[PDB]
Design a protein around this ligand. Sequence first.
Ligand SMILES: Nc1ncnc2c1ncn2[C@@H]1O[C@H](COP(=O)(O)OP(=O)(O)O)[C@@H](O)[C@H]1O
Ligand SMILES: Nc1ncnc2c1ncn2[C@@H]1O[C@H](COP(=O)(O)OP(=O)(O)O)[C@@H](O)[C@H]1O
Ligand SMILES: [Mg+2]
Ligand SMILES: [Mg+2]
Lengths: 337, 290
Amino acid sequence: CVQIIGGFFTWTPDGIPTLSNITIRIPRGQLTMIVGQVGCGKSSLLLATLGEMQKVSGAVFWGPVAYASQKPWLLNATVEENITFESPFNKQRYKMVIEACSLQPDIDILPHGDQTQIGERGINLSGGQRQRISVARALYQQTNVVFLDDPFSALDVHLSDHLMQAGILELLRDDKRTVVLVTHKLQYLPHADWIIAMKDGTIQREGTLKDFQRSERACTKYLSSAGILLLSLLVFSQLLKHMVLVAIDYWLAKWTDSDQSVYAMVFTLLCSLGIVLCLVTSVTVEWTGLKVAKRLHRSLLNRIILAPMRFFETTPLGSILNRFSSDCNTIDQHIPS
Amino acid sequence: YALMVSNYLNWMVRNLADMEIQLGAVKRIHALLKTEAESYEGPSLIPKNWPDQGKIQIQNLSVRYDSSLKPVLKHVNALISPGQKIGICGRTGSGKSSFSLAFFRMVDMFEGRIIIDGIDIAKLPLHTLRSRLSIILQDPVLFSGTIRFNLDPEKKCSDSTLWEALEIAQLKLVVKALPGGLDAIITEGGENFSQGQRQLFCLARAFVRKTSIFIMDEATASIDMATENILQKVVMTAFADRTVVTIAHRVHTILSADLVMVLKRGAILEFDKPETLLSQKDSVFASFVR
Ligand SMILES: Nc1ncnc2c1ncn2[C@@H]1O[C@H](COP(=O)(O)OP(=O)(O)O)[C@@H](O)[C@H]1O
Ligand SMILES: Nc1ncnc2c1ncn2[C@@H]1O[C@H](COP(=O)(O)OP(=O)(O)O)[C@@H](O)[C@H]1O
Ligand SMILES: [Mg+2]
Ligand SMILES: [Mg+2]
């Protein structure tokens, strides 16, 4: 049984708390409905019971616990993999978990009948599909205690009825596992053994039901954005500088092995020409880089803004963002040098 | 020059390889630029203020998410009188969220006609169509910043207006209990607010928008029934002089409405009288569900 005596914790090293004086006993093979208004530490009680949040002052006792959180998540893998979760496959077990989760028809409707590569976070899945998949994961695994954090938000009346009747009452209660399910519906109350009413982080009443009811194409546009006048000046200045550099060295070579003032003036003139031309080259290169950077970014953002929702759902968002950041950083800081 | 180039050769080869890699980077940017076919907005009905009369009518409507794929809606026909609350029901995959997304022209393969006060998209760009309605989603999103930025990014509201909008949306007490009431720092999602509170903040956006037509896709998704009933009563008393179309998996909310339509496998059917709509189906789709 899961035991808690003297619950007390807050979400900081120091601060006013939301967990205050919680006492709860959860015997095995028993259903427990936590209920209460919005913001009554239901998920927080679930996480503190999970040991993920060790209370400041209080005792809590009960292991590897399966758990489907209030905001589900999927792995970069296949559906079968998201439901196995490193556990070996089973012929009847997997089919039972699938046929209890109201998930086989939708799975077979998918483009790949199974092993469909679930996109990042599950974009190519619907709202209820991801919730059903998370519940299937938490329901397929072998463990004692299962926490279900509102697994009925993104389901209708009929799917919720079938799922609660098949998996929670027939499949879970079969092996006499322990179930802590937190939601708010009508059908579930007459089925559970314990009821826990929360209010402002405190347990209002406590116990079983009866006692509770008795209680009170790429470089072209790049060079065009660079500018047909700027890159041309860049190439021209580069070539001119290098012509000056080679010429001064050749002239000096022909002079050294020997109109001395003539050569002196020529050398002094070329030594200023070289620096003028090179300075011009560097300035032009930096200007070109900046222009490319900002025109490309402005084009990118207004190309993404004018996109239809089908394109946003279709495209993997991780690729969009990583291309954005990596490419823009490379262009801003690696392309000029 | 020989001793110079004997090193600058390897240097030059390395620089050329680097330029090639960076140019492939630029090429993937340019390939990303030109997709997302225009789908752009493109002035006779704009100069006239958008009518308050919420009379709408959809005739022979279909909808397809992807081009040349299976149809989601089929032979949709419905009408809605001005200033009347409209309820919609149906199972999963029935097409309610598709109905809402097509009401905003978010699905690019619709067939039929959508008339709103003798006015349709025949002379209107997409912006005036994005400003004419209000919509609350089943998927609550909240971007970081302050509460003023989530409630009104346009920054065109007085503090009393937002305080009243929160006190009407049943959210005032949990706002007052935070440091920096209207300036508390919100992070993307997080646990600063539970799912129900995010739903309430979406409701508050809807409150402050002050439009003529409302769409409510499961505002019941993560709200307790005890608070949800009184919240719906208050939201009906508040938005009395405007049309609201709801899709909730709660039975009582559907029950309180006058004109309720049930979406079928592909189609719909409308019914009005609460005593007639419950025995005409031979007590199958709306009575025993209640
Ligand atoms: N990590 C956190 N940081 C700050 N506040 C939190 C955190 N987690 C929970 N809370 C507060 O405690 C309450 C927990 O509410 P919750 O149990 O999740 O509601 P529900 O179960 O109905 O969705 C919320 O009101 C929230 O303000
Ligand atoms: N973004 C999408 N891309 C492709 N198909 C979709 C998309 N959204 C919904 N569908 C399909 O439309 C059908 C029902 O639409 P939907 O609006 O999701 O109904 P509901 O709101 O009741 O879940 C489903 O069979 C689903 O496969
Ligand atoms: Mg919760
Ligand atoms: Mg939906």
